[PDB]
Amino acid sequence: ENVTKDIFDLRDYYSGASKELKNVTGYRYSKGGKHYLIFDAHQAFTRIQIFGKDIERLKARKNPGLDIFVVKEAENRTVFSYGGVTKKNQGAYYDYLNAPKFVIKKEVDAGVYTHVKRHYIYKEEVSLKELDFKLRQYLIQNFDLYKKFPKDSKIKVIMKDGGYYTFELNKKLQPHRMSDVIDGRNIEKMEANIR
Ligand SMILES: CC(=O)N[C@@H]1[C@@H](O[C@@H]2O[C@@H](C)[C@@H](O)[C@@H](O)[C@@H]2O)[C@H](O[C@@H]2O[C@H](CO)[C@H](O)[C@H](O[C@]3(C(=O)O)C[C@H](O)[C@@H](NC(C)=O)[C@H]([C@H](O)[C@H](O)CO)O3)[C@H]2O)[C@@H](CO)O[C@H]1O
Ligand SMILES: [Cl-]
């Protein structure tokens, strides 16, 4: 299929680099009525822009023990990443916390091809920013996501109580959702329906 540049950009975004910061200390900083987390003379890390809902869980200024999922976003002024902040595990685990199956269904030649796989969850608090990125990346590399027009392609994260989270794959995840945090242990199963 003969896809437009916004699909290319989505493909480039989601197979770009990402970086997991763990148990890091971040410092609160506002400049021009926007809210950021910064680090240390010594940690030449990407600036994290944060949101209203992040503030409600952060402290006046210094903030140890954070886990950040960083994705470089492209230039303003300087380079930023949106959201992806969570608290470190409190529990101690042998390996992972949860392994819900990720059932991948791909429309094809008058058929559907299904692949089941496990997705290994390490964090008590996992942001939607991270499940969106890693999942779509996986699907780009292993299932040809964004080679054809995605149309209604969706990822669904389904919880134990039945509550779910949907990632419409024809658009980038809206900024304000990158700070939504769900409980890693209560993820029941995961679904993708794609072309
Ligand atoms: C113009 C625009 O983009 N508006 C945004 C909303 O999206 C629009 O409305 C939805 C219903 C769809 O029609 C979109 O195509 C349309 O653009 C946006 O609403 C949210 O959209 C997402 C998908 O983009 C999804 O449908 C959200 O609903 C759920 C979900 O399926 O993920 C419904 C779940 O019950 C709820 N889960 C709970 C409560 O456990 C979740 C959950 O709150 C979120 O997943 C947390 O991120 O949402 C639907 O809300 C809206 C909200 O982000 O923003 C508008 O800008
Ligand atoms: Cl099994």
From TrEMBL:
UniProt superkingdom? Bacteria
Q: Which UniProt keywords apply?
A: Signal
Q: List the record's Gene Ontology CC terms alphabetically.
A: extracellular region
- Residues forming the Staphylococcal superantigen-like OB-fold domain are 9-89
Q: Enumerate the spans annotated as Staphylococcal/Streptococcal toxin beta-grasp domain.
A: 114-194
**Family named by the database record:** Belongs to the staphylococcal/streptococcal toxin family.
Name of the protein in its database record = Exotoxin
What gene is this protein a product of?
set3
Q: Which residues of the full protein are shown?
A: 38 to 234 of 234
